[PDB]
Amino acid sequence: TRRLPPSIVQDTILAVVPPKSCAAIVDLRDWGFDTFEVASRVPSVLQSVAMHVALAWDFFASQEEAQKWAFLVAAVENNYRPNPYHNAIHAADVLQGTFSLVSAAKPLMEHLTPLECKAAAFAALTHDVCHPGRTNAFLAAVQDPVSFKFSGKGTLEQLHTATAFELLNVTEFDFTSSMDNASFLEFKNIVSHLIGHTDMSLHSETVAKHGAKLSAGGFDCTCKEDRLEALSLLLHAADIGASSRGVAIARKWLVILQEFADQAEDERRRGLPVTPGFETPSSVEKSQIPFLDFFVIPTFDLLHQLFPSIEEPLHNLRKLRELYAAKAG
Ligand SMILES: [Mg+2]
Ligand SMILES: [Zn+2]
């Protein structure tokens, strides 16, 4: 028999929870949207954003579908842990960011089907659900049951995907119940693909992959396959791009360093080797430059080339880098 310790990841909470009061949280399409700030003034930025996106993209024809969406998002929020970074605020940020990036690219926006838009919003909303605030490597290091259940790369990503569908399966949350089987399968496949590609281990491969697509002329949005890849890239960019929304906003998202430090200490307490660079850096600013240069900047450079209308992120990142470099020295 396999002797495994209890998982550090919590099981899915299927309970029906009352959605929070949503009010007009101001353009939802703006990249300068400060999710943390909105969260400080409204009961739930995640629920307010999800409602607005659903309306902005005319998701529902019936009130019944609208109500299931509301309860689903409330339940999804109930399944995000109180982590410094991988929490419901990050979820709202990625959802709003995906909405913003997609809305800014005319070719893609004009060719996306209603089903594809619903899948994109649902995926962004649930992309980190149940995240324990520890990495896939950490789960593997402690021999967590989740690492044995979901094999191969993207352990947590597979878990988020499975959790999302488990919740969507609850009758009171199933807003896709009216879709026929072929449509629901398409929905599921898009969602799986999108959440699956948020796995940081695929970054370099995706950048080279899309770089080649760019050289070949970019995406052909009349092609379903290209729209899916485009959505995947934009979701990924939204996931790792809060630092590109402006200097003030970027600073707020440095809370990711708290989770890394927490993990470094968790590793130390467990007697495991400490992950390089996870302990709080002496110079937050200096430590960020490599991240911007290796991950974020190249990503938004690629995005701008593939979608010329998405330019702001790149300029904000360069402004941020100069500030970090100037303060570091
Ligand atoms: Mg994730
Ligand atoms: Zn994320």
Side-chain angles (χ1 to χ4, degrees):
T1 309
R2 281 293 163 189
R3 179 192 310 177
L4 297 180
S7 174
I8 67 172
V9 180
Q10 197 179 324
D11 286 344
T12 307
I13 305 166
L14 305 171
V16 176
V17 302
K20 286 176 173 55
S21 184
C22 297
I25 52 181
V26 186
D27 202 309
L28 240 209
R29 298 178 301 179
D30 183 48
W31 192 241
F33 188 81
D34 185 335
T35 314
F36 263 118
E37 165 185 275
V38 177
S40 74
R41 300 169 320 196
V42 75
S44 167
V45 62
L46 178 61
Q47 286 177 59
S48 292
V49 169
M51 177 183 89
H52 294 182
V53 169
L55 292 175
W57 281 352
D58 196 14
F59 278 5
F60 320 112
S62 77
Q63 180 175 177
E64 185 179 307
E65 294 173 312
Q67 178 179 297
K68 286 173 177 178
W69 173 257
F71 276 97
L72 167 60
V73 182
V76 167
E77 182 165 13
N78 193 220
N79 278 272
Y80 269 93
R81 300 310 149 220
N83 291 317
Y85 183 101
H86 298 98
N87 54 50
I89 292 176
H90 169 63
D93 193 60
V94 176
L95 170 63
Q96 185 280 337
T98 298
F99 172 79
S100 180
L101 296 171
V102 169
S103 296
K106 181 183 175 70
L108 181 59
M109 253 279 73
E110 296 184 305
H111 293 78
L112 282 170
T113 63
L115 182 156
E116 285 167 349
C117 290
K118 296 175 185 166
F122 180 76
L125 184 153
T126 64
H127 91 279
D128 272 332
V129 69
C130 290
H131 198 299
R134 295 290 183 274
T135 66
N136 283 328
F138 179 90
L139 287 174
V142 305
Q143 292 160 34
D144 196 283
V146 173
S147 297
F148 290 85
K149 184 179 179 181
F150 300 107
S151 312
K153 307 166 186 172
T155 311
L156 281 175
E157 290 70 25
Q158 291 177 59
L159 181 143
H160 303 313
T161 304
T163 298
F165 297 142
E166 287 185 4
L167 289 167
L168 188 64
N169 188 55
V170 176
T171 69
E172 291 98 326
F173 311 150
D174 196 357
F175 75 97
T176 59
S177 62
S178 60
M179 298 187 159
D180 62 8
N181 292 340
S183 295
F184 181 56
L185 176 64
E186 176 71 350
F187 177 84
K188 208 162 183 187
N189 287 334
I190 291 171
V191 170
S192 173
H193 182 106
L194 299 177
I195 297 186
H197 285 67
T198 58
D199 173 16
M200 284 311 284
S201 88
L202 302 172
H203 183 267
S204 293
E205 190 188 312
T206 55
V207 175
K209 186 191 201 305
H210 294 141
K213 190 69 170 190
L214 168 66
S215 298
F219 295 118
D220 173 356
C221 296
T222 67
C223 174
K224 179 186 65 176
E225 294 61 45
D226 282 19
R227 290 200 302 277
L228 177 54
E229 301 185 305
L231 282 177
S232 184
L233 173 58
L234 293 180
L235 163 63
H236 172 54
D239 192 21
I240 72 173
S243 63
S244 76
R245 294 173 178 274
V247 177
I249 291 171
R251 156 133 295 189
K252 297 182 181 187
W253 291 96
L254 287 179
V255 284
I256 179 68
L257 301 178
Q258 291 171 355
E259 279 190 21
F260 289 168
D262 285 353
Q263 181 173 310
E265 176 59 21
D266 194 337
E267 293 164 340
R268 180 157 293 178
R269 290 172 183 177
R270 286 166 179 269
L272 302 176
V274 176
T275 301
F278 272 31
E279 300 193 323
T280 300
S282 57
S283 173
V284 178
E285 296 81 9
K286 284 185 181 178
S287 81
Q288 291 298 291
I289 299 177
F291 167 63
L292 300 173
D293 290 341
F294 188 106
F295 291 107
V296 200
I297 289 178
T299 292
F300 284 92
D301 172 355
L302 171 62
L303 260 189
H304 172 245
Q305 292 196 51
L306 282 163
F307 315 94
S309 57
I310 304 176
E311 182 173 342
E312 191 187 335
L314 185 54
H315 297 307
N316 290 341
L317 288 168
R318 287 171 173 171
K319 294 194 299 180
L320 179 65
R321 207 194 100 97
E322 171 166 283
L323 185 56
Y324 284 155
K327 182 177 183 178

